[PDB]
């Protein structure tokens, strides 16, 4: 930040929230349950609704 564009902190936070948003989406779409929610696509396979 001493040899660049003097402004990387906005660029860092906009990507990090996007990385969180897509990570919560992935976990809500797909989830085994290993440390994470039980996402929808595999969830209906459990009660066998397929």
């Amino acid at each position: 930040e001493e040899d660049a564009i003097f402004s990387l902190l906005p660029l860092l936070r906009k990507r990090l929230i996007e990385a969180h948003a897509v990570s919560i989406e992935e976990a809500f779409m797909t989830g085994d349950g290993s440390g994470k929610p039980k996402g929808l696509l595999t969830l209906a396979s459990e009660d066998s609704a397929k």
Binding site: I5, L11, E18, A21, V22, I24, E25, F28, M29, L40
Partner: protein, 50 residues
């Protein structure tokens, strides 16, 4: 290889031009599962419903 701009003598060296500090990106994905119900508030790390 490089030849920009050898016409007819003032060729320069490190590509003396100008650059833009604008950053762009295309599409981003549609966050459909991020807002499907309200954020139910919890004071505690578990909750029960009868």
């Amino acid at each position: 290889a490089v030849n920009q701009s050898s016409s007819v003598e003032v060729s320069s060296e490190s590509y003396e031009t100008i650059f833009s500090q604008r950053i762009i990106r295309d599409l981003q994905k549609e966050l459909v599962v991020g807002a499907l119900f309200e954020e139910l508030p919890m004071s505690s790390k578990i909750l029960t419903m009868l």
